[PDB]
Amino acid sequence: DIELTQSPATLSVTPGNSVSISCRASQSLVNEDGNTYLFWYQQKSHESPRLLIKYASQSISGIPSRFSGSGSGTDFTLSINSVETEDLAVYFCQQITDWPFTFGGGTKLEIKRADAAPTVSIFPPSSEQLTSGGASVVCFLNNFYPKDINVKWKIDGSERQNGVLNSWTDQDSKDSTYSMSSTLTLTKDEYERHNSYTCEATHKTSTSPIVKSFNR
Amino acid sequence: EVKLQESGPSLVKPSQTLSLTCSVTGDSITSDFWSWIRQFPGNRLEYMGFVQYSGETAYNPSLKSRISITRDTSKNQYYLDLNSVTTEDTAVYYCANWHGDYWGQGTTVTVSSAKTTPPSVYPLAPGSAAQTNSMVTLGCLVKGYFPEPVTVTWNSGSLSSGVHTFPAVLQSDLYTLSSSVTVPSSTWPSETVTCNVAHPASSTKVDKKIVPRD
Numbered sequence: 301d302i303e304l305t306q307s308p309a310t311l312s313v314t315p316g317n318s319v320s321i322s323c324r325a326s327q328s329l330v331n332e333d334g335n336t337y338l339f340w341y342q343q344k345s346h347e348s349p350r351l352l353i354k355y356a357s358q359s360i361s362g363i364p365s366r367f368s369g370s371g372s373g374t375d376f377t378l379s380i381n382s383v384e385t386e387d388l389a390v391y392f393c394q395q396i397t398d399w400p401f402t403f404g405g406g407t408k409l410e411i412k413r414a415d416a417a418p419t420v421s422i423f424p425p426s427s428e429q430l431t432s433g434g435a436s437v438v439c440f441l442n443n444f445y446p447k448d449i450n451v452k453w454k455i456d457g458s459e460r461q462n463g464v465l466n467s468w469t470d471q472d473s474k475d476s477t478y479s480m481s482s483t484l485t486l487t488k489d490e491y492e493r494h495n496s497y498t499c500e501a502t503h504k505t506s507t508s509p510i511v512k513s514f515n516r
Numbered sequence: 517e518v519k520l521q522e523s524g525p526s527l528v529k530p531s532q533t534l535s536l537t538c539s540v541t542g543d544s545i546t547s548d549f550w551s552w553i554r555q556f557p558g559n560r561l562e563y564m565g566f567v568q569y570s571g572e573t574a575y576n577p578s579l580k581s582r583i584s585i586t587r588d589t590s591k592n593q594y595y596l597d598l599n600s601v602t603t604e605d606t607a608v609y610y611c612a613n614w615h616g617d618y619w620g621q622g623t624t625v626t627v628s629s630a631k632t633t634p635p636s637v638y639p640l641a642p643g644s645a646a647q648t649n650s651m652v653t654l655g656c657l658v659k660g661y662f663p664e665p666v667t668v669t670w671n672s673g674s675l676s677s678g679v680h681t682f683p684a685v686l687q688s689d690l691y692t693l694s695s696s697v698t699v700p701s702s703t704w705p706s707e708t709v710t711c712n713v714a715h716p717a718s719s720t721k722v723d724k725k726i727v728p729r730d
Contacts, residue, residue, distance in 0.1 A: 301577075339616065348610050348619035349561075390559060394616070400576040403561040421653045421696075423640040424729075429657075436657060438640055440696045442680060465692065467682040481682040481694050483657075514643040 302326050304393055304404035313383050314412040321407045323376040323393035330373065330397070337397040340369055340378045343406075344389040345470045353378065385411060388473055413476035417505035418444035422498075422512035425491065435491035437484045439499035439512060443477040446504060453484045454498040460484060492516075518542040520611050520620035526717040527626050527663055534598045534625060538611030545569070545592055549614035552585060552596045554607040555622070562607075566614045567594060601627045624716075626663035633690060634718040635661035639711075640694075644729045651678075652704055654726045655696040656711035658684075666715040668695040675699065675709065 303326040313319045323338070330336050338356040341349035351360055353369040356376060366384070371377050380387055388411050393404040418441040425435040441449065447468070453460045463486060469479040482499065498513040524536035538550070552564040565575035567585040575583050582599035598605065605627045612619040640655035658666055668681050678698035684691040695711060703709075710725045 341616065348612070348622050349616065350619075351616050354615075392561065394561075394563075396615070399574060400565075400578070401563040403563065406559055419653075419698075421642070421655075423655060424643050426638040426640065426657070429636070429638045429659075432636065436638075436659070438655065438657060438694060440653065440655060440680070440694075442653075442696065442698075465685045465687055467685050467693070469680055469682055479680045479682070481696075483692070483694070485687075 302398045306404040306407045310408040312410045318381045321378040323404050325374040328373050329395050338376050339394045341392045342389050411476040413445050416445040420510045420512045430488050433488045435486045437497050439482045441480045441501050445477050447478045450502040451482045452500045456494045456496045518618045522620045522623035531600050536596045539593045550594050551614045553610050556607045624665050632717045633662040634720045635715050637713050637722050637724050639726045641729050651698050652701045653698045658693045660690040669712045670697045
């Protein structure tokens with residue numbers, strides 16, 4: 301089958317700047333009838349792919365002039381000449397010259413934004429959950445930038461590492477920020493042995509950490 | 517214009533057959549060729565095959581005689597049947613015209629021998645002490661369910677601008693996700709705020725009111 305290798309796997313950009321995504325095919329994509337079947341797609345979070353370019357460079361109607369395709373044979377490029385914040389998504393190349401039709405593995409485009417500190421919130425285990433016998437303490441770290449960040453849970457000042465589950469949101473198309481959620485899950489019995497529950501966030505936006513805390 | 521829509525089961529056990537339906541509205545299916553494309557966890561896409569207006573088909577060799585694509589032209593819908601599935605057949609299934617000009621919304625399908633587990637929906641209200649703040653953040657913890665997916669809305673989608681729904685994580689073979697909403701402190705508890713949670717696999721549809729901790 302014809303294999304498509306995209307490069308790079310991920311890249312970042314500042315609105316107004318341009319970006320360049322490549323697609324390498326294992327063999328020429330020029331059909332016996334001299335037509336090249338290289339298609340380019342844009343896929344946003346929670347959506348199906350959306351076709352942008354057909355036949356390597358032929359523009360679809362309704363796609364901004366921003367997007368352009370070039371290349372031939374085995375080497376193709378998708379270029380966006382003046383990136384808008386809406387443009388964040390995963391981009392794929394596809395060939396329909398040979399059977400079976402194949403896709404490249406995708407290229408993740410991310411945006412650059414001004415730095416931003418996270419809004420932190422801690423929540424005690426709900427009564428319903430404690431009734432069942434477990435105790436999850438949750439802390440939301442919303443709307444920050446850059447994505448790199450550290451969270452530490454502390455029980456009565458004592459640092460806790462085991463029992464934590466973390467989850468990162470995808471970058472926001474509207475404001476280019478990131479969000480994260482951290483949960484420390486304990487048995488009802490273990491939670492009742494301490495009083496102070498603390499969530500601390502360390503991020504570029506500060507030398508000192510943001511501390512959210514509650515006591516039983 | 518041309519609008520696509522997938523439908524089918526959320527969970528199917530190994531060795532069984534998976535069957536989906538693509539329902540088309542707008543034009544007639546005799547005006548084009550139609551396909552099935554799936555996306556695995558990792559986001560890799562595999563073109564499954566297509567069916568022409570004459571009933572003729574092309575199937576990807578990777579699906580070693582386990583696939584069948586047929587149609588119901590009067591009903592304006594086409595189908596997919598995949599044999600003796602295994603874990604590897606877990607993915608989200610999309611239907612699209614053969615060139616990818618139009619696509620449906622996609623449908624999540626998990627193949628497993630594990631039993632369906634409905635989520636425990638717990639509310640997240642701030643600890644009983646507080647209030648110097650102009651905004652207030654609440655949340656819902658959707659715990660220990662299987663398989664994926666579940667969807668969350670706050671107040672039936674009336675509250676959307678300050679929402680964050682986080683991707684589920686796996687813990688002891690079960691999924692757990694959370695969602696947060698931020699509103700002006702003058703709206704809650706003054707007015708109610710409820711998170712609506714749906715878990716398709718177990719046919720779960722629960723509304724949980726966020727109550728202040730007294």
